């Protein structure tokens, strides 16, 4: 431990060496000089966030309006055809002809392949879906097959007028599903009912302030207990993420099963914790109805918590109950706002009389659940009886409702769909019966893919840091770079998606529910890897969409306010046989032109690209801006490689050199050094590019540890720095460059006290995130590129608590583990100080350390005495996708995120029949 001045000198020498090597071997100056010297084949253009937000909002409104129009016409035609149906019985004479999918491949279809639909499709016929439990050959379904045989013409008309429709289906209470571009069922067993789907259920009823009141007496233990638990689980599954629910189990007293005590949003986390709670039921005691309904009613009368102010109902799960509990029904229901849905799960000798009487005297309905067979079917019927006010409202109630993003059930990715209910509109010029008009015939919907939405989002005209994201009133995100499936609808809150900050909370709480404005603020930015974060400032611009409840926002860091494009008009430089002279080329598989296809193999893709370019700027239907950009970018990169990298054939310390750039061209000077390139050729999706755009200094990216593929000694350490240009006075950051540092050279030049082969002191260097990059111990350097906490936790904890390092812990619910919650920890530099000293103590012994950050880099040099003298490992610091369960769902419902609800709800209709008991 020589001295602070000695450490100063050592750090100064190391920083000067590393910075001069990176700068010289990268040629950032040369690249900026090329850009600024040309300055005539391109043209910088303003990126007006407000204007682009408005344009995207109008386009998305127009698309959704088109879909709504199609859905409306389909519903009207269905209404007419069902109105004029003669309802025959004998179908022997007229053999009903229809294509039944999932059969042994009625019609023998041709099934021609087409684009935009990965599977074989047909257009002349539509396909019919039948759940396996539903029996065909009965008149009860064959009447539906008949009257729905007339929707094919309207399907064809929709597809003809607008060729961009993805899908269109009709779901009836019978169980049929007719979707137009007839494809074989994906199943080459399945519990698929069209009724048991989010898109069906959303349109079949209104949002509800529902409660479950489980009977938990001593008599409901065993087979009936498991039956009731399964029934409650499936009722929760039936419930959506715009409703509110609790489950109380009255046992001489209305105790709460869970830790909420008031109505909660019933999103995925609440659902899961409630499933755990209802799986941990203990049933021992007697029955007392009065307390249960009193507790439920005072929960339903809160009006201090976040609720929808909509169809408040109560569902009772009981085995046997004779109490009338009429002192809580007769008096405290002048508003008549409760619907008691009394169930009967399992087998019991107790009288059904009071149960059915309570069911049909409190505006609700009665059900009987004998076994597991009926739980899947006899659970969904409450939506039919909640739809009675909706059908009575009729034209007012007929509105299109869009769902959240979810995994398409036949492998087309993430899709949102519309919905519209279909009635017995049958003779209302006289209004003869109107008795079965209460029951809904079914719903129908049209699908739009997030690919179609993102086609309206030109993400390639700005920096990779910039992006579009859209949010719903519930607060979930519609589009986001971080929005990825796992294979359950994809649920991702805005705060959950991006970083969490008071300014973001404020903008969501204040100016997203129909307001327009902008705000520039400084907040942390999470790197694309789960390794790094960085400080920066951004401005968000948002507008409301008039057509739909959704809202759109745009993100623009204050260096992508402008963008660069090609001013009007080297192609042979992108040729594999010329790689040995022009670097090893990758090209980003962007949708450059409609003729070509995504060919991620990328070498046949590169030859395809250059072949198509050879086969002519005419471009009848060929995207010109991207082609111009990539050609200009390839010109710049090739000139760099020819004029700078060619002169120095090889350098002892420089294992490789590279460049990525806006347009999608990346080049490695040796083909041998390009063979072991592992990063994808999409410029916008590699992490180090974004990292270098964010940072103002050289960024050192640690290699991975314990991974297949040689990336430690035969690849080296990767450095990066973004290029900055000034044309008329405003900053632009087109590209980044970098090199590969030879590990052996770095060892032997770091050896320049800090001798090896001994355990007295450690001389170790880190970066922003505590990843090891160099060591002299000869046992740390073998395990290079791994988190410093996993090898030396005591010193890392001392650094964290002395606050040279800060950390955030994001939670990513969308992940694959072997639903899965990942604790993503990111360490970073917080304080703007470059000198740290002190003594860390583990008890009997002591250790002296002195760290100093390297200037113009994200590196820090730490000197400390060896751990041979001080055995100290309290707990191991690990930095990975942790298997955890956080935050606590009991505590975050007390202060829930701000939410807005629909203004239109249909409950308490004046003239409902409800005569059936
Ligand atoms: C509502 O639609 C149903 C079919 O889904 C109709 O049910 C049949 O209606 C005819 C004529 O009204 C009766 O002769 C049948 O016996 C009915 N079926 C059953 C099972 O009884 C129903 O009529 C429709 N409502 C109206 C007013 O037409
Ligand atoms: C090892 O460190 C030495 C300096 O201590 C570096 O030597 C310089 O190398 C650059 C080119 O890389 C030359 O332009 C300088 O003139 C050299 N200076 C001196 C004093 O030798 C060397 O680059 C380092 N090598 C590695 C592998 O990092
Ligand atoms: C069951 C037949 C169909 C329903 C439409 C389409 C075809 C699958 C569908 C659109 N995503 C609903 C669903 O995904 O379950
Ligand atoms: C919407 O419909 C109009 C008219 O039917 C059509 O011109 C247009 O291409 C459709 N699609 C979009 C996204 O506007
Ligand atoms: C329904 O079936 C009858 C024969 O049972 C047939 O005459 C009638 O045309 C069918 N309805 C249609 C095609 O709408
Ligand atoms: C970021 O932007 C804000 C507002 O425009 C500004 O006050 C702040 O100084 C900026 N950050 C830096 C690094 O200057
Ligand atoms: C759409 O909403 C914006 C938001 O304030 C409003 O200014 C505009 O007038 C609305 N346009 C229509 C046609 O409703
Ligand atoms: C990519 O395409 C080339 C065609 O030259 C082929 O040799 C190679 O095996 C392909 N790579 C993969 C991973 O399939
Ligand atoms: C490295 O990987 C192998 C297999 O994946 C495993 O057995 C071993 O424990 C790992 N070593 C370390 C240090 O993580
Ligand atoms: C995230 O980092 C910021 C910046 O220092 C800090 O104020 C905040 O408390 C951190 N949050 C978590 C969850 O660690």
UniProtKB/Swiss-Prot annotation:
Compartments it resides in: Membrane; Cell membrane
- Report membrane topology: Single-pass type I membrane protein
- Specify where it is mainly localized: membrane
Q: Which UniProt keywords apply?
A: Calcium, Calcium channel, Calcium transport, Cell membrane, Disease variant, Disulfide bond, Epilepsy, Glycoprotein, Intellectual disability, Ion channel, Ion transport, Membrane, Metal-binding, Phosphoprotein, Signal, Transmembrane, Transmembrane helix, Transport, Voltage-gated channel
Q: Which Gene3D superfamilies match?
A: PAS domain, von Willebrand factor, type A domain
Q: Which residues are glycosylated?
A: 66, 146, 280, 304, 424, 431, 537, 546, 601, 706, 749, 801, 808, 831, 844
* SMART domains xrefs: VWA
- Name the disease: Developmental and epileptic encephalopathy 110: A form of epileptic encephalopathy, a heterogeneous group of early-onset epilepsies characterized by refractory seizures, neurodevelopmental impairment, and poor prognosis. Development is normal prior to seizure onset, after which cognitive and motor delays become apparent. DEE110 is an autosomal recessive form characterized by profound global developmental delay and hypotonia apparent in infancy followed by onset of seizures in the first months or years of life.
Residue span, VWFA domain: 209-386
| Extracellular topological segments | 1-917
As stated in the Swiss-Prot or TrEMBL entry, residues carrying the post-translational modification Phosphoserine are: 93
**Any extra remark in the record?**
Binds gabapentin, an antiepileptic drug.
* InterPro entries registered for this protein in UniProt: Ca_channel_alpha-2/delta, VDCC_a2/dsu, VWA_N, VWF_A, vWFA_dom_sf
What GO biological process term is on the record, naming one?
cardiac muscle cell action potential involved in contraction
Expression (tissue specificity): Isoform 1 is expressed in skeletal muscle. Isoform 2 is expressed in the central nervous system. Isoform 2, isoform 4 and isoform 5 are expressed in neuroblastoma cells. Isoform 3, isoform 4 and isoform 5 are expressed in the aorta.
Per the record, GO CC terms? extracellular exosome; GABA-ergic synapse; L-type voltage-gated calcium channel complex; neuronal dense core vesicle; plasma membrane; presynaptic active zone membrane; sarcoplasmic reticulum; voltage-gated calcium channel complex
Protein name per the record = Voltage-dependent calcium channel subunit alpha-2/delta-1
Specify the domain of life of the species encoding this protein.
Eukaryota
| Motif mapping: MIDAS-like motif | 215-219
Give the free-text PTM comment from the record.
Answer: Proteolytically processed into subunits alpha-2-1 and delta-1 that are disulfide-linked.
**What SUPFAM superfamilies would the database entry show?**
vWA-like
Per UniProt, subunit arrangement is: Dimer formed of alpha-2-1 and delta-1 chains; disulfide-linked. Voltage-dependent calcium channels are multisubunit complexes, consisting of alpha-1 (CACNA1), alpha-2 (CACNA2D), beta (CACNB) and delta (CACNA2D) subunits in a 1:1:1:1 ratio.
Residues that bind a divalent metal cation: 215, 217, 219
Copy the domain comment.
The MIDAS-like motif in the VWFA domain binds divalent metal cations and is required to promote trafficking of the alpha-1 (CACNA1) subunit to the plasma membrane by an integrin-like switch.
Q: Which GO terms describe its molecular function?
A: metal ion binding; voltage-gated calcium channel activity
């Amino acid at each position: 431990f020589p001295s602070a001045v000695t450490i100063k000198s050592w750090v100064d020498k190391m920083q000067e060496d590393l910075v001069t090597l990176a700068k010289t071997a990268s040629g950032v100056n040369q690249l900026v000089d090329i850009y600024e010297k040309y300055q005539d084949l391109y043209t910088v253009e303003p990126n007006n966030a407000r204007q682009l937000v408005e344009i995207a909002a109008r386009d998305i409104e127009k698309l959704l309006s088109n879909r709504s129009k199609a859905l409306v016409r389909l519903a009207l035609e269905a209404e007419k055809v069902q109105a004029a149906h003669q309802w025959r019985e004998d179908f022997a004479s007229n053999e009903v002809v229809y294509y039944n999918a999932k059969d042994d491949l009625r019609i023998k279809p041709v099934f021609i392949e087409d684009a935009n639909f990965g599977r074989q499709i047909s257009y002349q016929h539509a396909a019919v879906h039948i759940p396996t439990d539903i029996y065909e050959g009965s008149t009860i379904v064959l009447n539906e097959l008949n009257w729905t045989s007339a929707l094919d013409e309207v399907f064809k008309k929709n597809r003809e007028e607008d060729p961009s429709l993805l899908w269109q289906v009709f779901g009836s209470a019978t169980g049929l599903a007719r979707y137009y571009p007839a494809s074989p069922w994906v199943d080459n067993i399945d519990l698929y009912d069209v009724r048991r789907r989010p898109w069906y259920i959303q349109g079949a009823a209104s949002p509800k302030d529902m409660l479950i009141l489980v009977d938990v007496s001593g008599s409901v233990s065993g087979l009936t207990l498991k039956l009731i638990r399964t029934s409650v689980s499936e009722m929760l599954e039936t419930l959506s993420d715009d409703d509110f629910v609790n489950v109380a189990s009255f046992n001489s007293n209305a105790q709460d099963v869970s830790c909420f005590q008031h109505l909660v949003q019933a999103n995925v986390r609440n659902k899961k914790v409630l499933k755990d709670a209802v799986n941990n039921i203990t049933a021992k005691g007697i029955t007392d109805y009065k307390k249960g309904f009193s507790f439920a009613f005072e929960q339903l009368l809160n009006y201090n918590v976040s609720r929808a102010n909509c169809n408040k109902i109560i569902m009772l799960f009981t085995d046997g109950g004779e109490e009338r509990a009429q002192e809580i029904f007769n008096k405290y229901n002048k508003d008549k706002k409760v619907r008691v849905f009394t169930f009967s799960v399992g087998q019991h000798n107790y009288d059904r009389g009071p149960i059915q009487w309570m069911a049909c005297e409190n505006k609700g309905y009665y059900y009987e659940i004998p076994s597991i067979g009926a739980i899947r079917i006899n659970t969904q019927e409450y939506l039919d009886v909640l739809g009675r006010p909706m059908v009575l409202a009729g034209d007012k109630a007929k509105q299109v409702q869009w769902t959240n993003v979810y995994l398409d059930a036949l492998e087309l990715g993430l899709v949102i769909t519309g919905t519209l209910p279909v009635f017995n509109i049958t003779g209302q010029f006289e209004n003869k019966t109107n008795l079965k008009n209460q029951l809904i015939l079914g719903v129908m919907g049209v699908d739009v893919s997030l690919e179609d939405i993102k086609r309206l989002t030109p993400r390639f005209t700005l920096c990779p840091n910039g992006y579009y994201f859209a949010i719903d009133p519930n607060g979930y995100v519609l589009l986001h770079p971080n929005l990825q499936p796992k294979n359950e609808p994809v649920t991702l809150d805005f705060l959950d998606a991006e970083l969490e900050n008071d300014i973001k909370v404020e903008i969501r709480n204040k100016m997203i529910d129909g307001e327009s404005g902008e705000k520039t603020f400084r907040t942390l930015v999470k790197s694309q890897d789960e390794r790094y974060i960085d400080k920066g400032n951004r401005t968000y611009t948002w507008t409301p969409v008039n057509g739909t409840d959704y809202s759109l926002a745009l993100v623009l860091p204050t260096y992508s306010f402008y963008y660069i494009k090609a001013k009007l008009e080297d192609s042979e430089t992108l040729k594999p046989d010329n790689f040995e002279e022009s670097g090893y080329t990758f090209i980003a598989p962007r949708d450059y032109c409609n003729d070509l296809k995504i060919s991620d193999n990328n070498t046949e893709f590169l030859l395809n690209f250059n072949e198509f370019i050879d086969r002519t700027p005419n471009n009848p239907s060929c995207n010109a801006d991207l082609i111009n950009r990539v050609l200009l970018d390839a010109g710049f990169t090739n000139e760099l490689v020819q004029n700078y990298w060619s002169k120095q054939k090889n350098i002892k310390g420089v294992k490789a050199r590279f460049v990525v750039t806006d347009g999608g061209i990346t080049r490695v000077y040796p083909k041998e050094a390009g063979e072991n390139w592992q990063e994808n050729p999409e410029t916008y999706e590699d992490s180090f590019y974004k990292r270098s755009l964010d940072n103002d200094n050289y960024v050192f990216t640690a290699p991975y540890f314990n991974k297949s593929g040689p990336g430690a000694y035969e690849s080296g350490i990767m450095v990066s720095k973004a290029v900055e240009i000034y044309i008329q006075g405003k900053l632009l950051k087109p590209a980044v460059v970098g090199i590969k540092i030879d590990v052996n050279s770095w060892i032997e030049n770091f050896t320049k006290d800090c001798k090896r082969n001994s355990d007295v002191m450690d001389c170790v260097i880190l970066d922003d995130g505590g990843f090891l990059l160099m060591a002299n111990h000869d046992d740390y350097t073998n395990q290079i590129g791994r988190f410093f906490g996993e090898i030396d936790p005591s010193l890392m904890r001392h650094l964290v608590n002395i606050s040279v390092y800060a950390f955030n812990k994001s939670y990513d619910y969308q992940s694959v583990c072997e639903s899965c919650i990942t604790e993503q920890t990111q360490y970073f530099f917080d304080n703007d100080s470059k000198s740290f000293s002190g003594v860390l103590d583990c008890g009997n012994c002591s250790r002296i350390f002195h760290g100093e950050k390297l200037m113009n880099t994200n590196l820090i040099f730490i000197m400390v005495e060896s751990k041979g003298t001080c055995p100290c490992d309290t707990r191991l610091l690990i930095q990975a996708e942790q298997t955890s369960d956080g935050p606590n769902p009991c505590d975050m419902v007390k202060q829930p995120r701000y939410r807005k609800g629909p203004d239109v709800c249909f409950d308490n209709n004046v003239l409902e029949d409800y005569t059936d008991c």
